[PDB]
Amino acid sequence: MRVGERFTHDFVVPPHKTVRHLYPESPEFAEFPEVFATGFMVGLMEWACVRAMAPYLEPGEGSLGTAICVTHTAATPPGLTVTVTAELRSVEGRRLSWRVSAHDGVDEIGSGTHERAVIHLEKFNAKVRQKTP
Amino acid sequence: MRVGERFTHDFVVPPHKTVRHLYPESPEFAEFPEVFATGFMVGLMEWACVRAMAPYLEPGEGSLGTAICVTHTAATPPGLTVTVTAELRSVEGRRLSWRVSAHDGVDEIGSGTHERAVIHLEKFNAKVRQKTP
């Protein structure tokens, strides 16, 4: 894993990544235009960085996204390909940072940073169990 | 809209808002802990601000999220209630800027900022339809 290294991930946007599919519970989002949701764009950016860092993980480890700081600057209807480019910015022990950017073949659609934390999967799962009703 | 007014939005996390459900197509996400995905928390934050804004828009207007910049510092299993607090920072023309935070009953789970832009729904939908391949 080298700082400055770029990793790219391509995703054809299907009809079920539009706003209304993120929260079908939301009467506000029900009649929103059929565009790729910011929260799905976030999920796609984080997926790119997960794939970029898979080699860094030891047995028993996973990762969590601990911050997302991005713009979303143009809208994308289903059928276009979103390409995320993740450039590694820092790696120190458990903490990793990237600059991410996305383009849907027509426009740059957003960019910023994402941070992740390496976790011990079983210890983490025990913590989550203890706050599960 | 009044600057500095705080709006809250509560949401019981169901099983279908964990990481694996954000991208069922991602084999990487399919093995994550069953915790509320950052992309879903982002959408819940947007939803709170949409609700807050609704009485102030003219008929046929909606809005887009244009930036999100938040931490995500504690994990949330299904069954907890996530409360989002949104507070208006400024309104400049079509641009609204918010401070957002969320808490799951147990921990503060994230905070930061979010910006939105007011749109004319029909006009935006027609423009989007026109970049559809």
UniProtKB/Swiss-Prot annotation, chains A, B:
GO terms for molecular function: acyl-CoA hydrolase activity; protein homodimerization activity. Substrate binds at residues 36-46, 65, 116. It catalyses: fluoroacetyl-CoA + H2O = fluoroacetate + CoA + H(+). Its EC number is 3.1.2.29. It is an enzyme of class 3 (hydrolase). InterPro entries: FlK (IPR025540), FlK-like_dom (IPR054485), HotDog_dom_sf (IPR029069). CoA binds at residues 65, 72-73. This is Fluoroacetyl-CoA thioesterase. It comes from Streptantibioticus cattleyicolor. The gene is flK.
